[PDB]
Amino acid sequence: AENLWVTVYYGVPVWKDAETTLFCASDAKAYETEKHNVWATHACVPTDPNPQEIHLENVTEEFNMWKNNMVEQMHTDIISLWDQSLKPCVKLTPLCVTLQCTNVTNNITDDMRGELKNCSFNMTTELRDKKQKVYSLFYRLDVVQINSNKEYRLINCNTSACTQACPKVSFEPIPIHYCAPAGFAILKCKDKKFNGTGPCPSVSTVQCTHGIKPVVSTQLLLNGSLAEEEVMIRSENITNNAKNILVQFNTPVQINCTRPNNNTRKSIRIGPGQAFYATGDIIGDIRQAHCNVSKATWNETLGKVVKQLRKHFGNNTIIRFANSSGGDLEVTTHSFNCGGEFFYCNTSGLFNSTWISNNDSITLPCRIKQIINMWQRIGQCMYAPPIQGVIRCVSNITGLILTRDGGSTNSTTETFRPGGGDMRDNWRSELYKYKVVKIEPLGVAPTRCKRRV
Amino acid sequence: INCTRPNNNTRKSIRIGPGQAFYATGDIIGDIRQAHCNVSKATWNETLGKVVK
Amino acid sequence: QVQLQVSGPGVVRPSETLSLTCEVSSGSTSRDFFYWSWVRQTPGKGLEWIGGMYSNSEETNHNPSLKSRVIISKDTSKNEFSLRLTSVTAADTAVYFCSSRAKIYYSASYSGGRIDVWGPGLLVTVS
Amino acid sequence: DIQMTQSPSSLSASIGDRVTVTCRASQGIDKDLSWFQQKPGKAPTLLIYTASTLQTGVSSRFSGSGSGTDFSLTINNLQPEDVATYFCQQDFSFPLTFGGGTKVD
Amino acid sequence: QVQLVQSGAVIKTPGSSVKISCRASGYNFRDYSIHWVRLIPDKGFEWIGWIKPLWGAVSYARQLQGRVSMTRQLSQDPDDPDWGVAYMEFSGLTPADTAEYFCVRRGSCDYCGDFPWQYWGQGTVVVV
Amino acid sequence: EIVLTQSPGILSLSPGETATLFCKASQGGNAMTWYQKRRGQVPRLLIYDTSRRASGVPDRFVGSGSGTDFFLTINKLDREDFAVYYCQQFEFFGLGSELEVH
Amino acid sequence: AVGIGAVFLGFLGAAGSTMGAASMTLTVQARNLLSGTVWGIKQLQARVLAVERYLRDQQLLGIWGCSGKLICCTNVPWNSSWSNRNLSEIWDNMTWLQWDKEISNYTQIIYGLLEESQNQQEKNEQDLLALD
Amino acid sequence: AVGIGAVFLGFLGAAGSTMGAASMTLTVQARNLLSGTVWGIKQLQARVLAVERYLRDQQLLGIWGCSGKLICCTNVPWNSSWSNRNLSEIWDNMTWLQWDKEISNYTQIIYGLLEESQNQQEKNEQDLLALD
Ligand SMILES: *[C@@H]1O[C@H](CO)[C@@H](O[C@@H]2O[C@H](CO)[C@@H](O[C@@H]3O[C@H](CO[C@H]4O[C@H](CO)[C@@H](O)[C@H](O)[C@@H]4O)[C@@H](O)[C@H](O[C@H]4O[C@H](CO)[C@@H](O)[C@H](O)[C@@H]4O)[C@@H]3O)[C@H](O)[C@H]2NC(C)=O)[C@H](O)[C@H]1NC(C)=O
Ligand SMILES: *[C@@H]1O[C@H](CO)[C@@H](O[C@@H]2O[C@H](CO)[C@@H](O[C@@H]3O[C@H](CO)[C@@H](O)[C@H](O[C@H]4O[C@H](CO)[C@@H](O)[C@H](O)[C@@H]4O)[C@@H]3O)[C@H](O)[C@H]2NC(C)=O)[C@H](O)[C@H]1NC(C)=O
Ligand SMILES: *[C@@H]1O[C@H](CO)[C@@H](O[C@@H]2O[C@H](CO)[C@@H](O[C@@H]3O[C@H](CO)[C@@H](O)[C@H](O[C@H]4O[C@H](CO)[C@@H](O)[C@H](O)[C@@H]4O)[C@@H]3O)[C@H](O)[C@H]2NC(C)=O)[C@H](O)[C@H]1NC(C)=O
Ligand SMILES: *[C@@H]1O[C@H](CO)[C@@H](O[C@@H]2O[C@H](CO)[C@@H](O[C@@H]3O[C@H](CO)[C@@H](O)[C@H](O[C@H]4O[C@H](CO)[C@@H](O)[C@H](O)[C@@H]4O)[C@@H]3O)[C@H](O)[C@H]2NC(C)=O)[C@H](O)[C@H]1NC(C)=O
Ligand SMILES: *[C@@H]1O[C@H](CO)[C@@H](O[C@@H]2O[C@H](CO)[C@@H](O[C@@H]3O[C@H](CO)[C@@H](O)[C@H](O)[C@@H]3O)[C@H](O)[C@H]2NC(C)=O)[C@H](O)[C@H]1NC(C)=O
Ligand SMILES: *[C@@H]1O[C@H](CO)[C@@H](O[C@@H]2O[C@H](CO)[C@@H](O)[C@H](O)[C@H]2NC(C)=O)[C@H](O)[C@H]1NC(C)=O
Ligand SMILES: *[C@@H]1O[C@H](CO)[C@@H](O[C@@H]2O[C@H](CO)[C@@H](O)[C@H](O)[C@H]2NC(C)=O)[C@H](O)[C@H]1NC(C)=O
Ligand SMILES: *[C@@H]1O[C@H](CO)[C@@H](O[C@@H]2O[C@H](CO)[C@@H](O)[C@H](O)[C@H]2NC(C)=O)[C@H](O)[C@H]1NC(C)=O
Ligand SMILES: *[C@@H]1O[C@H](CO)[C@@H](O[C@@H]2O[C@H](CO)[C@@H](O)[C@H](O)[C@H]2NC(C)=O)[C@H](O)[C@H]1NC(C)=O
Ligand SMILES: *[C@@H]1O[C@H](CO)[C@@H](O[C@@H]2O[C@H](CO)[C@@H](O)[C@H](O)[C@H]2NC(C)=O)[C@H](O)[C@H]1NC(C)=O
Ligand SMILES: *[C@@H]1O[C@H](CO)[C@@H](O[C@@H]2O[C@H](CO)[C@@H](O)[C@H](O)[C@H]2NC(C)=O)[C@H](O)[C@H]1NC(C)=O
Ligand SMILES: *[C@@H]1O[C@H](CO)[C@@H](O[C@@H]2O[C@H](CO)[C@@H](O)[C@H](O)[C@H]2NC(C)=O)[C@H](O)[C@H]1NC(C)=O
Ligand SMILES: *[C@@H]1O[C@H](CO)[C@@H](O)[C@H](O)[C@H]1NC(C)=O
Ligand SMILES: *[C@@H]1O[C@H](CO)[C@@H](O)[C@H](O)[C@H]1NC(C)=O
Ligand SMILES: *[C@@H]1O[C@H](CO)[C@@H](O)[C@H](O)[C@H]1NC(C)=O
C-alpha cells in the first residue's frame, strides 16, 4: 500500500505563461452601421453577447504589464490595419505642384500671423489635354516657401506621395475585444490596489477582453477606463526617470473641444474617378480652435495626483508641474482626433502649478494640421479631408503620461512634465489587467491503484 | 577565380518624384579600364587534364 | 576487418612507444557518441582497462595506474582508435582489446539498454 | 579505485547444473556491474548489463541477482557453450576495474 | 556594427554656445534613445539628458535647464533608414564647462535597461 | 538623489594578482553598473545588472552584491586591466577607483 | 421544484482547489479545449495551431495505456525519489500549479517509463495470444 | 554508472532490418509522423495535408478492430493464396519494402475483410448484450 502507481489525468486545469496571437472581434452593433464607415466593421467576427468571466478561488499569479505580450500585438495590428484602410483611396500624385499662395482675406495684424494661406494652382482636369486653375485654403503647418514672387509647396513634396484618406471612412473608435483561441485563456486581475506588477490575489478568467476604445492621444489619454476608488500611479521603475509614469485617476475630467470656423467642402476633379476635397470659403469669423476644462475639477484632480505622488517620494516633497520641454509637434503638445479632424492643443495652461508639503474654465488654443505623419514612417504620409460645419466634441480626460526630470545635485523638489512618446503607453493603460496563458492538460500524479491486466 | 571592376564610380541620386530616387553613374574616378577576371594557369591546365582523364 | 579490430605492431622494443590502432566506426546518427576504450588482458592479473576517450570530445579518460603514460587519440575519418603507450616495459605484455562504449536507448527519454561489446584482441609482447 | 573480487577462479559442474558466480566490491557500486563471457582466445562478449537486466541475444539461462557490493550471476541448465571465462565489470567510478575470471569446466 | 561619430574638438569663448553633433549608424535609429554625458577632470562624470529620436521627446538634468537643448534629424529615404543625426546645443558657456562630452546608446539585450550605455562615441573636448 | 561612494580609492597591486573593489549606495533595491576606462581612451561597459558581463568581456570580471553593498572582483589581473573603474546608478556616478601597478 | 437556482460551473473553475476537487470537473475543461484579407490567415493559423496541439495531446495519450479515456492507471510504480510526498498531503492540500512546479524535472522520464511499460504490455499481450 | 554512452535511435532507422527488429522501434516512428506572404499559405497547406493524412489513417484504423493501439489482432484468417510464405522467412529474413512490393495487389481485399469482420463482431457484441 506504501508503493504508489502513476496515473495520467487529461484535462487537468493548469496553465503556463505564453505568447500567442489573439484574434480581434468587434461588436455586431457596428455592423448594423455598415458599408465600411470605419475599419473592422467588415473584417471582424461579431462578439459574444454574454462575455462570461469566471471568478476564481484561492489562486494567485504574478503579472507584469511592462514585459507583457499582446500590447505589441495590438500596436502591430492597429498599425497594419491603419495601413490597410488606405490602399483603395487616392494618391495625391498630381498635387505636389507649384502653389501660388496669398494671405487669406482677413484684417491682417502685422505682429501676429494669419494661420490660413489661400493658394491657387494649375491642376489637371479629367481630360489629359485641358488643365484648370483652381484655388483652396491651407494652414501654415502644411506648406513651405521655396526660393518678389511668393510661391509655396507642400511640406511632403520630398519624402512621399500623400495618400488622401477616403472621406467615406471615419476615424471614430469602436470597442474591439481581443479573444483568445481555443487552448488559451485570458486572466484579468480584479484586485483594487494592484499597481500592475507582482502577484495579484483575485484573478478571473474570461474568453474575451472588455471594451478597448482605441484612442490616438499623446498626452492626456482620452476615453479610458476609470480607476476604482482612488488615483493610481504606475511605473516599471520609479527611480528610473527614463520610464514614463502612467497616472489613472478615479473621477473623469470633462473636456470640450471645438473648431468654430465654418468651412466649405469643395471637390476638385483630379482625373477619372479621382476627387480631391479642399477647403472652400470660411463662412463667418476666422477664429482659433480651442478646448475647455473646468478650473475647479482640474485643480482638485491635480491635488489628488499630488496626494498620491507623495506616497513614492516621502511627505516633505515639493511637487511642481511644468510644460513639455521640446521636440516635435505631437510630443510636446497633446494631439487627438475629434471626428476625422486632428487637433494639436497647447497644454501649458494645465501643467503650471506648485504644491507644498503643508465657475471659470481653463481655455487652451490648438493648431489644426491636415497632413499627418502618423507613427513616423519613412514614406507614408496622409492628407485629411476638411469636414463641414462647426466641429465640437466632448471627451473625458482619464489619465496622464508623466516624466520626472533629471534630478541630481541635491534636488529638494521633483518636477513632472507631460510627454506622449511611444503610442504603446496608451495601450498599456488598457491591457494592464489581462495576461494570456496556455492551457496544458494531462497532468500526472500517483495513487494507490495498479492496472488489472 | 578573382573578378573585378577597377573603375571607381560615383553613385548619383536623381529625384524622379515624391519619394522616388533614381541611382545613376556620376564620375569615373581615375582610369577608364576594362573589367576582368583571372584564373590560375597551372591549376586550370591540371583540372582540364583531370576532366580529360 | 571486423568491428573493434585492433591492429598494429605485436612487438614493442623496451622503453619505446607502443602504438596500436583499432577499426572503429561512426554511429547511426551524427548525434550519437561512443567512448572507445583500451583494455588489456594479462596472464598475471585479470582484465585491466588502459584508457579511452569520447568520440565527441578530445579529452582522454584513462587509468592512473599507468600514471598518465598513455596518448589516447582517434581519427573517425580514418576508422582509427590509437593508443600510444610510452615507456613500455615487459609488464605491458598483454592481449589488448579495444571496446565500444555506448547505450542502446529507443526513444528520447529513457535508457533502454547498454551495449559494451568488445572486439578481438591483439597480443603485444615487450622484450 | 574500487577493488572487484570475482569467485571462484574455476567451478566444475555436470551438464544441466545451476551454478553461481559471486562478485564482491569494496565500495558502493550499487547496480553498476556487468557480466561478460570470454571464450579462451576470443573477445569477451556481453551477458548482463546493470547487474539484473538480461541483454538481448543471450538466453534466459544467464540471470543476475544481488545489490550494493555483492552480486551473483546464476546459470540454470549449464551448457557446453558456457565453457568460458566470466568477468564482472565495475563502471561506477573511474577507473574501470573488472573481475578476476571464472572458468567453467 | 554600431558606430557613433562625433565632431572634432572645439575651442570657444565664455558666453558663447557650442553645437555638438552625433551621427549614429548601423542600427534602426528610431528605436533606441540617445543620452548625453560629460566628463570633467576632478569631478568625474555628470549626466546631461536624453532624447528619444522617434519624436524628439527630451529630458534634461535639473541643474542644467535653460542652458542645454537637444534636437534630432531623421533619415527620410527608403534606402538608408539606419543612419541618423542627434544634436546638442550647449549655451551659457563658463570656463567651468571645459570637459569631454560623449553621446551614448544603451545595449540591445532583454535585461538591458536604458542607463547601461553600451556604445560610446569617441568624445569631444570643449575648452572655454 | 542617490549618492555613490567607492571605498578603496587608489589600489596598487601587482599583475597576476586578484583585486576586489567595493561600492556603497544610499538607496538600495536597484541594479549597479560597472565601467572601465583606461588612460586617455574611450570608456567601456564592464558589468550591467550587477551580475551580467557585457560584450567583449572575459569571465575574470565577476560582479556581485546586494542591497547597498556591491563588489567587483577581478581575478588574475593583466597590465591592460590597470585602469579606472566607475560605479553607476541610474544617472549618478562615483568618483572612480584607480588601479595601479605596485 | 419551482424556485430552482443554478451555479454555472464554467470553463477553468478549479484552479486553486485541491486535486480531488478538480478531478470531477476536468471533463468540461477537456471539452472546452477544442472549439473556439490577412486576418483570416491569422485566425486560420491560430485555429490550426489549436488542432495541432489537440492532436499532439491525443497522439501522446494514445501510445500510452489509454486511447480516449480521461482517467488512466498503468503498471509503472511511482518512484519515491521524485517527490517523496504521501497520499493525503498531495490529494487534499496541494494545488495544481504547485504540483506542476514540484515535479517539472522528471516529466520526460515519466513519459518514457509509461511508453516502455505500454510497449512491453503490447508485446506481452501479443505473446499471450500467440499460444492461442 | 559514470562513463555512460548512448546511440540516438532516431526516426526511420529500421528500414533494411527485419520485421521483428522494426516491431520494437515502430512506436517512435509513429510518434514523429505528426508534428514537423504566400509562403505561410504553402506551409499551412502542407501542415493541414499532414493532419489530413494522420486523421485519415486514424479513421481507417478506427473502423477496424483497434481504436488507438499500434498492434492489432483480428479474426480474419490469412489467406494462403495471397503470398504462401511461412512464418520464419517472413519474420526473420524479409525486409519491409520487399514485403510491401510482394502483396501490393490484395491490400484493398484485406481492408474489406477487416471491415466486414469488425462489423459482424460489432453486431455479435450488440446481440450478446441483447439477452442481458
Ligand atoms: C470619446 O468618446 C465620446 C463618446 O462617444 C466621443 O464623442 C462622440 O464622438 C463622435 C465622433 O466625433 C461623435 O459622432 C459625430 O457626431 C456628430 C454630431 O451629431 C451628433 O448628434 C446628432 C443629433 O443628436 C446625432 O444624430 C449624431 O448621431 C451624433 O450623436 C455627427 O454629425 C457625426 O455624424 C457624421 O459622421 C458620421 C460618421 O459615420 C456619419 O455617419 C453621419 O452621417 C454624419 O455625417 C458623428 O456621428 C459623437 O457625437 C460624440 N458623442 C457625443 C456624446 O458627443 C469622443 O469623440 C471620444 N473621443 C475622441 C477623441 O474621439
Ligand atoms: C484690424 O486690425 C488692426 C491691426 O492692424 C486694428 O488696428 C488697431 O486698432 C486699435 C484700436 O482700434 C489701435 O489703437 C490701439 O488701441 C489699444 C487699446 O487702447 C492701445 O492700447 C494701443 O496702444 C498701444 O499701441 C500704440 C501704437 O499703436 C502705442 O503708442 C501705445 O503705447 C500702446 O503700446 C493702440 O492705441 C491700433 O493702433 C491699431 N493698430 C495699428 C497697427 O495701428 C483694427 O482696429 C482692426 N479692425 C477691426 C475692424 O477689427
Ligand atoms: C502655450 O501657451 C502659452 C501661454 O498660455 C504660450 O506662451 C506665450 O508665448 C509668447 C510667444 O510665444 C510669449 O512671448 C510674448 O510675445 C509677445 C509678442 O510681441 C511679447 O510682446 C511679450 O512681451 C510682453 O510681456 C513681457 C513680460 O510681461 C513684457 O516685458 C513685454 O514688454 C511685453 O509686454 C511676450 O514676450 C509669452 O510670454 C508666453 N506667455 C507666457 C505666460 O509665458 C506658448 O507660446 C504656447 N505654446 C506654444 C508652443 O506656442
Ligand atoms: C527597476 O525595477 C524593476 C522592478 O523590480 C527591476 O526589474 C527586475 O530586475 C531583476 C534584475 O535586476 C530581474 O531579474 C530577477 O532578479 C531577481 C533578484 O536577483 C531574481 O529572482 C532573478 O535573478 C536571478 O538570476 C540571475 C541570472 O540567472 C542571477 O544573476 C541573479 O543573481 C539571480 O540569481 C530574476 O532574474 C527581475 O525579473 C525584474 N523584475 C521586473 C518585474 O521587471 C529593474 O531591474 C529595476 N531597474 C534597475 C536598473 O535595477
Ligand atoms: C513652456 O513654457 C514656456 C514659458 O513661456 C514657453 O517658453 C516660451 O516659448 C516661446 C516660443 O514657443 C518664446 O517666444 C519667443 O518669441 C520671440 C518673438 O519673436 C522669438 O524671437 C523667440 O524665438 C521665441 O519664439 C517665449 O519667449 C518663451 N518664454 C519663456 C519664458 O521661455 C515654452 O515654449 C513652453 N513649451 C511648450 C512646449 O509649450
Ligand atoms: C482665395 O483666392 C481666390 C482667388 O484665386 C478668391 O476667389 C476670388 O474671390 C473674389 C472676391 O469675391 C472674386 O471676385 C473672384 O471671382 C474669385 N475668383 C474665383 C476664381 O473664385 C477667393 O475668394 C479667396 N478665398 C478666400 C477665403 O480668401
Ligand atoms: C501677407 O503675408 C506676408 C508674409 O508672407 C506678410 O509679410 C510680412 O508679415 C509679417 C507678419 O505677418 C510682418 O511682420 C511683416 O512686416 C510682413 N512684411 C512686410 C514687408 O510687410 C504681409 O504683411 C501679408 N500682407 C500683405 C498685404 O502682403
Ligand atoms: C497656371 O497655369 C498658367 C499657364 O501656364 C500659369 O500662367 C503662366 O505663368 C507664368 C509665370 O508667371 C507666365 O510667364 C506665363 O505667361 C503664364 N501663362 C499664362 C497662359 O497665364 C500660371 O502661373 C499657373 N498658376 C496659376 C496659379 O494660375
Ligand atoms: C508594486 O507593488 C509591488 C508589490 O505588490 C512592489 O513589489 C515589492 O516592492 C518592495 C519594495 O516596496 C520590494 O521589497 C519587493 O521585493 C517587491 N516585490 C516584487 C515581487 O517585486 C513594487 O515595488 C511596486 N511597484 C511600484 C512602482 O510601486
Ligand atoms: C455653416 O454654413 C452653412 C452655409 O454653407 C450653413 O448652412 C445654412 O444654414 C441656414 C440656416 O441655418 C440655411 O438657411 C441655409 O440654407 C444653409 N445653407 C447651406 C448651404 O447649407 C450652416 O448653418 C453654417 N453652420 C453654422 C453652425 O451656422
Ligand atoms: C463642456 O460641454 C458641456 C456640454 O457638452 C457643458 O455642460 C453644460 O453646462 C451648462 C452650464 O455651463 C449646462 O447648462 C448644460 O446643461 C450642460 N450640458 C451638458 C450636456 O452637460 C460643460 O459646461 C462644458 N464645460 C466647460 C468647461 O465649458
Ligand atoms: C586571387 O586572389 C587571391 C587573393 O584574394 C590571391 O591570393 C594571394 O596571392 C598572393 C600571391 O600572388 C599572396 O601573397 C597572398 O597572400 C594571397 N592572398 C590570399 C588571401 O590568398 C591569388 O593569387 C589570386 N589569384 C590570381 C590568379 O590572381
Ligand atoms: C507620510 O504621512 C502619512 C500620513 O498621512 C504616513 O502614513 C506616511 O507613512 C508618511 N510617509 C513618510 C515617508 O513619512
Ligand atoms: C502659469 O501661471 C501663472 C499664474 O497663474 C500665469 O501668469 C502664467 O501665464 C502661467 N503660465 C503660462 C505659460 O501661461
Ligand atoms: C524636404 O524639404 C524641407 C524643406 O527644405 C527640408 O527641411 C527637408 O530636410 C527635406 N527632406 C529631405 C528628405 O530632403
Coordinates of N, CA and C in Angstrom, one line a residue, chain C residues 42-127:
Chain C
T42 N 45.9 -9.5 -19.2 CA 47.2 -10.0 -18.8 C 47.1 -11.5 -18.3
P43 N 48.1 -12.3 -18.5 CA 48.2 -13.6 -17.9 C 48.2 -13.5 -16.4
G44 N 49.0 -12.6 -15.8 CA 49.2 -12.4 -14.4 C 47.9 -11.9 -13.7
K45 N 47.5 -10.7 -14.0 CA 46.3 -10.1 -13.5 C 45.1 -10.4 -14.3
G46 N 44.0 -9.8 -14.1 CA 42.8 -10.0 -14.9 C 42.7 -9.1 -16.0
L47 N 41.5 -8.7 -16.4 CA 41.3 -7.7 -17.4 C 41.6 -6.3 -16.8
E48 N 42.4 -5.5 -17.5 CA 42.8 -4.2 -16.9 C 42.5 -3.2 -18.0
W49 N 41.6 -2.2 -17.6 CA 41.3 -1.1 -18.5 C 42.5 -0.2 -18.6
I50 N 42.9 0.1 -19.8 CA 44.1 1.0 -20.1 C 43.6 2.5 -20.1
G51 N 42.6 2.8 -21.0 CA 42.2 4.1 -21.1 C 41.0 4.2 -22.1
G52 N 40.8 5.5 -22.6 CA 39.8 5.7 -23.6 C 39.5 7.1 -23.8
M53 N 38.6 7.4 -24.7 CA 38.2 8.8 -25.0 C 36.8 8.7 -25.6
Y54 N 36.1 9.8 -25.4 CA 34.8 10.1 -26.1 C 35.0 10.3 -27.6
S55 N 34.0 9.9 -28.4 CA 34.1 10.2 -29.8 C 33.7 11.7 -30.0
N56 N 33.0 12.3 -29.1 CA 32.6 13.7 -29.2 C 33.7 14.6 -29.0
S57 N 34.4 14.5 -27.9 CA 35.4 15.4 -27.5 C 36.8 14.9 -27.7
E58 N 37.9 15.6 -27.3 CA 39.2 15.1 -27.4 C 39.9 14.8 -26.0
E59 N 39.1 15.0 -24.9 CA 39.6 14.7 -23.6 C 39.8 13.2 -23.5
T60 N 40.9 12.8 -22.8 CA 41.2 11.4 -22.6 C 40.9 11.0 -21.1
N61 N 40.2 10.0 -20.9 CA 40.0 9.4 -19.6 C 40.7 8.1 -19.5
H62 N 41.6 7.9 -18.6 CA 42.5 6.7 -18.6 C 42.6 6.3 -17.1
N63 N 43.3 5.1 -17.0 CA 43.5 4.6 -15.7 C 44.8 5.2 -15.1
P64 N 44.8 5.8 -14.0 CA 46.0 6.4 -13.4 C 47.0 5.4 -12.8
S65 N 46.6 4.1 -12.9 CA 47.6 3.0 -12.5 C 48.7 2.9 -13.5
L66 N 48.5 3.4 -14.8 CA 49.6 3.5 -15.7 C 50.3 4.9 -15.6
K67 N 49.8 5.8 -14.8 CA 50.4 7.0 -14.3 C 50.6 8.0 -15.5
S68 N 49.5 8.2 -16.2 CA 49.4 9.2 -17.3 C 50.5 9.0 -18.4
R69 N 50.8 7.8 -18.7 CA 51.8 7.4 -19.7 C 51.2 7.1 -21.1
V70 N 49.9 7.3 -21.2 CA 49.2 7.0 -22.5 C 48.9 8.3 -23.3
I71 N 48.9 8.1 -24.6 CA 48.4 9.1 -25.5 C 47.2 8.5 -26.3
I72 N 46.0 8.8 -25.9 CA 44.8 8.2 -26.5 C 44.3 9.1 -27.5
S73 N 44.3 8.7 -28.8 CA 43.9 9.6 -29.9 C 42.9 8.8 -30.8
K74 N 42.3 9.5 -31.7 CA 41.3 9.0 -32.5 C 41.2 9.7 -33.9
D75 N 40.8 9.0 -34.9 CA 40.5 9.6 -36.2 C 39.3 8.9 -36.8
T76 N 38.1 9.6 -36.6 CA 36.9 9.0 -37.1 C 36.8 8.9 -38.6
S77 N 37.5 9.8 -39.3 CA 37.5 9.7 -40.7 C 38.3 8.5 -41.2
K78 N 39.3 8.1 -40.5 CA 40.2 7.0 -40.9 C 39.9 5.7 -40.2
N79 N 38.9 5.6 -39.4 CA 38.5 4.5 -38.6 C 39.6 4.1 -37.6
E80 N 40.2 5.1 -36.9 CA 41.4 4.9 -36.1 C 41.1 5.1 -34.7
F81 N 41.3 4.1 -33.8 CA 41.4 4.4 -32.4 C 42.9 4.0 -32.0
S82 N 43.6 4.9 -31.4 CA 45.0 4.7 -31.3 C 45.4 4.9 -29.8
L83 N 46.2 3.9 -29.3 CA 46.9 4.0 -28.1 C 48.4 4.2 -28.4
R84 N 49.0 5.3 -27.8 CA 50.5 5.5 -27.8 C 50.9 5.4 -26.3
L85 N 51.1 4.2 -25.9 CA 51.7 3.9 -24.5 C 53.2 4.2 -24.6
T86 N 53.7 5.0 -23.7 CA 55.1 5.4 -23.6 C 55.8 4.7 -22.5
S87 N 57.1 4.5 -22.6 CA 58.0 3.9 -21.7 C 57.5 2.4 -21.4
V88 N 57.3 1.7 -22.4 CA 56.7 0.3 -22.3 C 57.7 -0.7 -21.8
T89 N 57.5 -1.3 -20.7 CA 58.3 -2.3 -20.2 C 57.6 -3.7 -20.4
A90 N 58.2 -4.7 -19.9 CA 57.7 -6.1 -20.1 C 56.4 -6.4 -19.3
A91 N 56.0 -5.5 -18.4 CA 54.8 -5.6 -17.6 C 53.6 -5.3 -18.5
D92 N 53.8 -4.7 -19.7 CA 52.7 -4.3 -20.6 C 52.5 -5.4 -21.7
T93 N 53.2 -6.5 -21.5 CA 52.9 -7.7 -22.4 C 51.6 -8.3 -22.1
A94 N 50.6 -8.1 -23.0 CA 49.2 -8.4 -22.8 C 48.5 -8.5 -24.1
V95 N 47.3 -9.1 -24.1 CA 46.4 -9.1 -25.2 C 45.5 -7.9 -25.1
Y96 N 45.6 -6.9 -26.0 CA 44.8 -5.7 -25.9 C 43.5 -5.8 -26.7
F97 N 42.4 -5.5 -26.1 CA 41.1 -5.3 -26.7 C 40.8 -3.8 -26.8
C98 N 40.2 -3.4 -27.9 CA 39.6 -2.1 -28.0 C 38.0 -2.3 -28.0
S99 N 37.4 -1.5 -27.1 CA 36.0 -1.7 -26.8 C 35.2 -0.4 -27.2
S100 N 34.0 -0.7 -27.7 CA 33.0 0.4 -27.9 C 32.2 0.5 -26.7
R101 N 31.9 1.7 -26.2 CA 31.1 2.0 -25.0 C 30.0 3.0 -25.3
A102 N 28.8 2.4 -25.3 CA 27.6 3.2 -25.7 C 26.4 2.5 -25.1
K103 N 25.2 3.2 -25.2 CA 23.9 2.6 -24.8 C 23.0 2.5 -26.0
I104 N 22.1 1.5 -26.0 CA 21.1 1.3 -26.9 C 19.8 1.8 -26.2
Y105 N 19.4 3.1 -26.4 CA 18.2 3.6 -25.9 C 17.3 3.8 -27.2
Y106 N 16.0 3.6 -26.9 CA 15.0 3.6 -28.0 C 14.3 4.9 -28.3
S107 N 13.8 5.5 -27.3 CA 13.1 6.8 -27.5 C 13.7 7.8 -26.5
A108 N 13.5 9.1 -26.9 CA 14.3 10.2 -26.4 C 14.4 10.4 -24.9
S109 N 13.6 9.7 -24.1 CA 13.6 9.9 -22.7 C 14.6 9.0 -22.0
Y110 N 14.4 7.7 -22.1 CA 14.9 6.7 -21.1 C 16.2 6.1 -21.6
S111 N 16.6 5.0 -20.9 CA 17.9 4.3 -21.1 C 17.9 3.1 -21.9
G112 N 16.9 2.2 -21.7 CA 16.5 1.1 -22.6 C 17.6 0.0 -22.9
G113 N 18.8 0.1 -22.4 CA 19.8 -0.8 -22.7 C 21.2 -0.2 -23.0
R114 N 22.2 -0.9 -22.6 CA 23.6 -0.5 -22.8 C 24.3 -1.6 -23.5
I115 N 25.1 -1.3 -24.6 CA 25.9 -2.3 -25.3 C 27.4 -1.9 -25.1
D116 N 28.1 -2.8 -24.5 CA 29.6 -2.6 -24.3 C 30.3 -3.8 -24.9
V117 N 30.0 -4.2 -26.1 CA 30.7 -5.3 -26.7 C 32.2 -5.0 -27.0
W118 N 33.0 -6.0 -27.1 CA 34.4 -5.9 -27.3 C 34.8 -6.5 -28.7
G119 N 35.9 -6.1 -29.2 CA 36.5 -6.7 -30.4 C 37.6 -7.6 -30.1
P120 N 38.0 -8.5 -31.0 CA 39.0 -9.5 -30.7 C 40.4 -8.8 -30.6
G121 N 41.2 -9.3 -29.6 CA 42.4 -8.5 -29.2 C 43.6 -8.9 -30.0
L122 N 44.7 -8.2 -29.7 CA 46.0 -8.4 -30.3 C 47.0 -8.5 -29.2
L123 N 47.7 -9.6 -29.2 CA 48.7 -9.9 -28.2 C 50.0 -9.0 -28.5
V124 N 50.4 -8.2 -27.6 CA 51.6 -7.4 -27.8 C 52.6 -7.8 -26.7
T125 N 53.8 -8.2 -27.1 CA 54.8 -8.7 -26.2 C 56.0 -7.7 -26.2
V126 N 56.5 -7.4 -25.0 CA 57.5 -6.4 -24.8 C 58.8 -7.1 -24.3
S127 N 59.8 -7.2 -25.2 CA 61.1 -7.8 -24.8 C 62.1 -7.2 -25.8

